[PDB]
Design a binder for this molecule. Structure first.
Ligand SMILES: Nc1nc2c([nH]c(=O)n2[C@H]2C[C@H](O)[C@@H](COP(=O)(O)OP(=O)(O)OP(=O)(O)O)O2)c(=O)[nH]1
Ligand code: NA
Ligand code: NA
Ligand code: NA
Length: 153
């Protein structure tokens, strides 16, 4: 089994809207996140990436899922720990890396999101917790995947 590298993903989910960021360099909407760094907890890494990529600070996050990504031709898995929050207290800021944008929850931009999001995003919206795995060929093609609702992440 391949080694895996730790990542975070943060979704700011309010009652009628969700905050996504457009990757400027890419072209897809996503939550905010990145690699966990040495010596920080996964949750603290998620808080740090949220602040670095969107400008938003939150004191706490709720872990809602975990997704492992495998890419054909790449030696490592990406182990993505997915967090939510409903409570923010500043404005999102656009950088040269991510442009934040709010979407109403009847306008989730799936056509411009990664293909796996179509499977697990609906569980997140239902307040369900999940474990997923997706094997991609390139950016567009899923060759294999698993997804399961769990009571504990
Ligand atoms: N919704 C969704 N999110 C994904 C998928 N694959 C995937 O890596 N992510 C998330 C997890 C990561 O936090 C982020 C990709 O990490 P990144 O490449 O932006 O990491 P980074 O910013 O630290 O790297 P760098 O370019 O700044 O050096 O996107 C996916 O298929 N769907
Ligand atoms: Na980042
Ligand atoms: Na990132
Ligand atoms: Na899509």
């Amino acid at each position: 089994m391949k080694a895996s590298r730790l990542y975070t993903l943060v979704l700011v989910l309010q009652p009628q809207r969700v905050l996504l960021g457009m990757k400027k360099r890419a072209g897809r909407w996503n939550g905010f996140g990145g690699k966990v760094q040495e010596g920080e907890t996964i949750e603290d890494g998620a808080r740090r990436e949220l602040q670095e990529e969107s400008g938003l600070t939150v004191d706490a996050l709720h872990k809602v899922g975990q997704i492992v990504f495998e890419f054909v031709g790449e030696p490592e898995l990406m182990d993505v720990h997915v967090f939510c929050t409903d409570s923010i207290q500043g404005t999102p800021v656009e950088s040269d890396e991510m442009r934040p944008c709010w979407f109403q929850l009847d306008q989730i931009p799936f056509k411009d999101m990664w293909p796996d999001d179509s499977y697990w995003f609906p569980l997140l919206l239902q307040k369900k917790k999940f474990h997923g795995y997706f094997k991609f060929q390139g950016q567009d093609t899923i060759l294999d995947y698993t997804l399961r609702e769990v009571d504990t992440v």
